[model samples]
Target: TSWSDRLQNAADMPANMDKHALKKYRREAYHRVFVNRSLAMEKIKCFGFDMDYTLAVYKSPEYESLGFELTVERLVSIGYPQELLSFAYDSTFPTRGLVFDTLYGNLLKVDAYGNLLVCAHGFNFIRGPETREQYPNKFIQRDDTERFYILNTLFNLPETYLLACLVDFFTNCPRYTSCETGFKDGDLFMSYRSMFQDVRDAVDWVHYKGSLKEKTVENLEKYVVKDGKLPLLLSRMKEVGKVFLATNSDYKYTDKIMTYLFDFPHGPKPGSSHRPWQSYFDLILVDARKPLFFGEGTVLRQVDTKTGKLKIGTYTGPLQHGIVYSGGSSDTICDLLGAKGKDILYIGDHIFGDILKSKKRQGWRTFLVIPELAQELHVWTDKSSLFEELQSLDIFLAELYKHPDISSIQRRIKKVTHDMDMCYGMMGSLFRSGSRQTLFASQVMRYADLYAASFINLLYYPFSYLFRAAHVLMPHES
Candidate 1:
């Protein structure tokens, strides 16, 4: 979807509402993204890239949407009785960190109260405020839809396997309701995790007995977004200098996906359009076995895809080297790139794969491409305010010392709590308004230097806001 179209659908868009709150937030979000100091290009020798969200950026909702569509198909194949597939994509059916009782087959999503907002058998919304509060209306609104779409389902390929497994596990069993026994408020959470275990078990079952692997191969194109600026991101990085391809994906898939996402349909000769991967990388490593690839001394085996042969070897080469090899140590890539620890910068979407080695093992400059964090940045922070209010109410309540005659103080405290609740409700409406109006635009201002949610935002960055000098490290510390 076009960014403006998405902005139009969003409730937080200033044009959609009668206020400037969301507009202001977008402006601030833009500023937050660009103003920060760019990771010094001189410090890094070669950049390693991850394919999915990292480079071939898609319209998130459209990308997520395909997952949902496939989920319906996956459901039908598992003897889910076809009718269930007709169920419209209800994004509110799941929420972040929500635990499901897979054995019991209950789908759950939480409300702002941190209470179970929705629980259903099979595909119905059995218990939720959406039913009781909005009694006559069972359908969810747009805000809920977006959340349901983005959070519950994984949009891209590797994620599709996980989501497909989850749908089959939950929808296949007719009377399943998995549970963990504990007599406390948070016990359902334990049960929810058991649900994930169920999904994993289902995946294992499919791999063992069914043609799931074949189905995945057949449907590969649906999951991968072949058109994106990743080539551009890589090429642009090369202009500043240093680019690499490091991945856990076997080199074949890496080459195939790269060809799909970046290779020009026509030849790269004159009068023919060219693709992005044309001479942009400084180094390429496949199956580097990261974390271990950082320290483990594995043999560097280069795969010749056309010949289907592996050339196994070790690195005793000079700096600025270029060879497609696998199973090398992180030190190998570092040495090839010719940069000391502090002089290297690695950017990736996955913290563990592309970056954990850098973060924990190697300590190269790290840039995390957290695509979801942009939407969630405000959601979590807004909830933080409510948490603070709850804290203040607790302190005030404690000030009364639980005295017997503190009834009046209790009443006043209750009123204050109600006010906080009211504000929360209003904010919920604002959040629902969908324009991305966050309460703490300034928070992004503070952290923009450290990370970015999307790589595209990085393209036009240094937006004049991030360069503001800090007064001190901390008010108390300084």
Candidate 2:
């Protein structure tokens, strides 16, 4: 058969075929969960989740705009100029995993090793010569989380743009004197470090003390995306082993959001009795304070579900039904679940807080929830021409390295690379910027054993199905 005929046949195949056939179909369809380290579904005795953006997927523009507006108001309330209130959230402007350089007030796209790929100063692209002033060697120390903040989650999307907005406002506004790293507001010198901190605090405050969560709970359909398949997926997970909810959100908020998530007319499938979200999970832990939860975290406390408040003493009991937990570490989870770290598979959206820490500190296998991957993969498949051009340029550049005249080829390579990068957005692809792998992408590969646009995609696979990692090879091996 011709390649076109093969493609047609593949497309015509049934989605719910037997496990072996489904595995083969997924490979051809490109819908399979990609693996870095091999993970066996059969071995996973417990499955965990993070609340925001993972299980409770928020609607894109609506949620982001709400966050942006709330954060702007908070900024204005805290002595910032009223002009900030005018800036609206543009969903297209911000991409996840861009690093904010606090010292230089620039948004940077960096490689795994902290080499700069692209740098922008307040919506304006800072080219080679100009960028050199701030990034002397076109490099960053990503380990210094204090100086460089990686906007790694969907929650960070609005503030990412807001940070740029504030920087641009302060830089151009005559009222504030512009400095090397930040602005001097008369008696107060506001560094980008402080500005970034304020944005983070404002976002957190909006979620906790402010109205973001309240507004979301008030109208779930307006802000949160509901999937009927969610319960079905959870049911399947429970069939094999235990399932758990370990979110940073408090119990009251968790209850409100989770109740809505499982508010479907039928439970698991049509005609089945409606069950509470708590029924799907073997254990429910809220206010987990992850990353730290994986490390040296606070004492474990049990939440008084009667009043939605914490009980007086330390929690020292086996896992019980209908009981909510609060402020616990990873060890607490292991002890209560009676499972080892290696026996569990924790799923979440945060790379550092959810995937990295759990995998690094504990020995849990991880599944990353990257909502952006759905769109990112679409762009990758649709824009083949641009990618092909980049590949040709790379080949040409390699040949030029041995020739006498290579400067012209070098410029062409740079131009095509920039074009390819801009196809994703002004910042470019979260996984790569030209030939280099991004720090965000590197972390995902390093930490997450498996990943997908949504964890619900796992519902298509059988409980005992093996998820094999695609083999990677060196240049010479290829």
Candidate 3:
């Protein structure tokens, strides 16, 4: 069958399928959970979550704009030109996992191996070859942590834009002469490295100093996605195993968001259906300082839930009910819960903090909550024909060096891939750049045992459901 015919048939077949056939025909990719490595639900003894982006998915543009506004205000307070406030957050400007070069002021998109796919200077995209002036190899060492910072979470969405905005401001302002790395205002000079430091400091202060959190709490529904399914999902998991929350956020913020999330009413409205959010978890941990919690942790302190202060002493006895603890290690959890490392399954959005270290340092199964995934899946499903045509085109070129129409066909392939990419995001899908899986996708496949747009997607499946990984084929195997 032709590419169009195959996609059309695939899309048409599901709607007509009866209930049972639809089980096997579950091509509702947007809502489905994807598996990286096979895991048995029966073996998972405890389920844990991270609050920020994992359980509480922030609303788009709104959250980023808040962070941007607060951070800009912070910068202006610290003597930056008042013109900084005029710059607004642009949703299309940045993508997750892009590398920010402190030296050259370029945000780059790369594959798993650090080959540049796209590079942009502020709002302007710097294309191939021209990028070679600074990035001589058109490649970067991702491990250069000091130089290249990977924008890791939804929190970084605003940071990403603010950095770009600052760089653009310093470079284009008539009073400042553009330098290779930063800008010169009269005799005063600032390196992009220094500019980045100010932005970083500003953003950190905004979060830790109560500026950003206050904004979010003041208008919860506008900034946070309030899904009734969150409570339902947690309640179901509590039936089968233990559940807990481990987050970097302090108790007050965690309480505010969790309360908002669980405040849903019965009959799809408000009533006795409203239960205290704390009841949903067997244990509650806040200010977890994760990635560190997976490592040698700081002193654990119990929260004064009423006063919202840390109680005077370190918590050493068996974990207590109706109380939250701060800064405890993973061992503290296992020791109290009577579960081993392999028995705990953690669900979170941070690749390094919640997935990588927990899986590697300890043996917890990891579920990566990628909220952007829902949209990406829809685009992948709808753009099925362009994908297949590109696949066929690659095979068509592989067998022979065709003397005729080869040049024209290359452009056709390029156009098709570009057309398909814009369907997802300006920089393209977080998972892919054309046919190549991105560095972010690489981390997901390696570190996360399971992933979805939200953990609530698990609600569609029974507790006993075995989420098996799809078998992959090698070039030779196929």
Candidate 4:
């Protein structure tokens, strides 16, 4: 991993990365999430990688927002009419690894075995099921991450192939009519969220063929790089400790992508089903049924690269005698690495698989990289003035309520609020400041993605991360 590969075209970095005015806030988050910032200088030992959105970045909400919009549009095109396309982009629609049950017109978020943990309506699953079914198997379980991956990545909305699929389905697929009523095109457009669902459903209904799959494959290439370019990360982390790909995505796929993404043209490949890519993984584990992988009795198998298979070695019981394994659990790895739960840092994008359960169930140090959070940061960051005005109004209202002379004080507060609104109006309209507002929103997203851009500034403000971190985690809760 040379400088060229690790830091190519620094100029192409998104705005949020550029807008990072300072580093204090990022330093705090880094310290908060990762124990002991001083570890960078001393204690830190190993770094593990999570493949999907963690090591490799994606546009996230921007890409999914587009996909949702397209999915709704497709619903409309499929004789569902225009009204259904209005469903807005609700973050609740899709979780990291959720399964959509086509038959019941329901969405299911499952555990590793496809066990139902949660269910939802078109975009709102927060409440109970829209229409509960007695039988569980009626709900289709999705095991592949590529389902949403293909819809958002490879395919374009307002696409011709998408259009044809809808036309064909409405005319022929009896399933659409049987599922529910009011799935017209106009219905989807009637709401932003509904429209999103339409596009999602269309991609689900229509089968992707040669060109479409190839396009997806190409898009995957643009974004999904091997082990998320971890070897490149070696340059940064090698300064502190050893870095390993302790993921569940098997050895070969891991090796393939690592080679392709890191080595580019000169990476290695496997032959037949037996050739091992164990070199890429300090400890390669496959079929690792995680949540369980963190347990005991998992025999360590040394993968023979030439044969691309596994063999049982003498039982070591712990990871200290480190060998590349196809599958194991967090408990085993933690013990093997000789690292404390607090000291071990896990940077993963998936909440359930990578961070949440492991952190809650096993106490591993966690750093979450939610790509959608970037968009959220953008929205709030740009609209910060409105928030400030609201805050001011809240204080004014509170003080006015406290006044013994209610009516006059209410009138005075109203006038003050009116002035604030007028100021905001001026900012939005005649001031030529729309670009700055837009830039604020955009930078919110950028700040979130880079960690240094927007949040650092916010945290450094009077009562930001520093104040809170001091008070909350202080030796005393008070």
Candidate 5:
């Protein structure tokens, strides 16, 4: 019992009774760069970057709030009711990787097999037996993408909250009679499907029509996190191999966000002369339209830096410094840099748009940048008591299967889970629900070679660092 309280219980108990090794051992588990697959960094000859969350980390709640306000205004301007303007963004309520079932208007937390781990109707969370009326077996065909919308990206965050507000509004408003399938407003019935498209259109309009960019650019300091470390990492990386930037963003927006990110007075390292942000990369391509970029790329056009316009013809010229290219394929980079797919390591924040396609379509190595991991790791480290309480309960349950006081133990489990869930936020950790890994977490392990909260974490490691994946063992091995 005394041994269980000490760090020496497991990992600290090194073989041959080495006391000093525990420092390095514990540090490894706490390292920022986590490995999902064994990767030899020495073999990587090129480095790739995604612009948005990968390199340019947007400040939370502030950015999400801005998007929420603009989208709500956009919705009110349309035929939507005036009450929509009162809805505010609650960052704590929605979790990433949630699926919205448009047909029944229920938000679902699902695993790889489409099992409903958590379900909700607006603010009201649905319980096990109650979910069956619509879910049929508490599951659905995940392949039916038509009926479901996966709010998987950080970009979709505002919409996640907005959609919930819409559902709540329609359900509670006296003007409409709420039904399982649609809302009846006298003779005109509005399906959740049509309501969702309204939110989707307004959300898209904020980005595609250019108001989000305007607000972001006007208040860059408020929206984007400008870290000096990004340039420093790229400088060190440049010494070993070629570095490139490939993004879904257009040239002007990318230029605006990036220049702010590189706004430090000094250069890559502290006290050096400042350099232009464009100078750090050997290749720069904008409007990449990735997933498609990995497959057949669009017409590769060069941009005139002075005018910020695409050059008149196809970019037949050799890759040079400072000249940004638009609508290029992955092949354009490989051809220009003289590198193979495996030779490059591409870092991105979007799981489906950035990581999956590159790794699946091409043979490229991937580094996933998860901004939420920083906070999740913080909770996991600080709230070990909650996890330990959970672990001991599981052991207690396993020892007897079901005791005379089974109900008490079950209630305690639920209480502890609520406490743990609140520590991360209202919806819990992005990577997990109570016991099961989320769809997002499974995709990360399957697609990424390495992942971290920030790509700049790489600066702490050497160029030739060999990231070894944690072992995958069966129950028999334990």
Candidate 6:
């Protein structure tokens, strides 16, 4: 059913409903459009989007597993042993936004400042002195991308688990001698950095130079999630202002995926004739090479839609409909669209590339797409008992802080926190390690003004909706 129908159904609910039921309904509505920083949706002029994960929401384990198997094959093709073929993708093993220490081959869960919160060597959890051996200072220089690779997106989940699996395999196998960086296979010394590079390249190959995109295009329903409300949402946005798409993916991939997304019998609703997905956007850009596209980037070239290849010369004209663009900086987007950074609300799944860089470098409003949030919220609600106990412990700790002898309370607090953390998994909450926030959570707060499991959540409100930020208070203010 469409979002409009859902809202109408909600409005038609019995007026004699209990206050508890009404309150529950209101809470669900508010949770859908979570506000991080205050954003006046009324002020938004141009709405921008990223393709993969954002617009083209891939099915969870299916997509990740495909990527994992393909990457393993790529590794085998590049001279890795046939034993690597036995490795399988385990969806439960990976959490997004992990930092892989190339120097040590350890997967680290870090705080915002790169302080180690959790360290894992493959499936093995490394603790205490073992963690200290690699992270001597218990911190990582995150800025050094060469040494630390941040597995920050859902797309990186396959590689994230694969990295751990390979590390564990080499460490246990007597055939290969273990080294600090990676493993020594006979005379060949494979550093973790090089291994990571190979995995990264393989994943890229699977998506670009390989058949991942082709297979996805052939079976869209299996890979991509479809919501009838997607078109309805875009139509509403266009009614207020312009909407555009700027994705790193090429035109062909975007076209196939987008076509499937808009493949309903009708257009915005059930009665209207189906319209092409391109009709929803004012401008469409592909191969934008974002993060870099937000900063200094490649020359802006137009795409020849007829041939599905880039045109010969550079694009020097104004933004025109039915024209596709490739490789341009944020300035080019602003100039062609006739909108400044603050005027646009750019939505995507990539925290750093699509949200952080655009918001930080260009001051564009940001909306983060976190598919895991749907499950995360369910866990948060279901595990309320644990959370409540943890909260009580915090209060107890605060009260005890006033006393000189508070060692007992401190130990209790630590125990309660650990219990709460374990509710999520072995690594714990994606947003936190305990009381402290995870680096992933910090970036979401800093960069994204708004976020949700799906952009279709926007359809719950009107085009002129005012998303007010929640107020926080100091102890005294309370």
Top TM-score hit:
2
How well does model 3 score by local distance difference test? 0.81
Cα error of candidate 1 at position 318, Å: 6.1
**RMSD (CA, Å), each prediction:** 10.8, 4.9, 5.5, 12.7, 6.7, 4.6
On TM-score, the stronger of 1 and 4 is: 1
Candidate ranking under lDDT, highest first, comes to 2, 5, 6, 3, 1, 4
Provide the lowest-lDDT 10-residue window in model 6: 2-11
Measured by TM-score, how close is model 6 to the native structure?
A: 0.90
**Whole-model alpha-carbon lDDT for candidate 2:** 0.83
Q: Could you tell which candidate, 1 or 5, scores higher by TM-score?
A: 5
Tens-digit lDDT track of model 5 for 1-478 = 1111121122122122133553354355433588899889999999999998778777787888899999999989987899988888888888888898999998888887789877888888887789988888888777898999999788888988888888888899899999988799999999988888888899889998949999999999778777666777788799999999999998999999999988877897667999988889999999899879999989999988888888899988887766789998999999999999999999999898889999999989999988777667767888888878888887887766643557688788778877887777656778776666778889999999999876766765667789898789999998
Best by lDDT: 2
Error of 1 at 167 (Å): 11
lDDT of 6 at 60: 69
lDDT of 6 by residue, 290-402 (tens): 89998997899999888889999999988777888899888887888789888999999999999999988889999998877766776677777766776777787777778
Candidate 4 RMSD to the real structure: 12.7
Candidate 4, residue 478: the lDDT equals 47
lDDT tens digits, residues 449-474, model 3?
99987776666666777889988889
lDDT of each: 0.47, 0.83, 0.81, 0.41, 0.82, 0.82
Give the C-alpha miss distance for residue 416 in model 3, angstroms: 3.3
Q: Put down candidate 4 lDDT per residue, 361-473, tens digits, no spaces.
A: 66665555543333333344556665566556557667867764565555555454334323322112111121122222222222211222111122222212222212126
Candidates 2 and 6 compared: the better one by TM-score is 2
| Candidate 4 residue-wise lDDT at 83 | 46
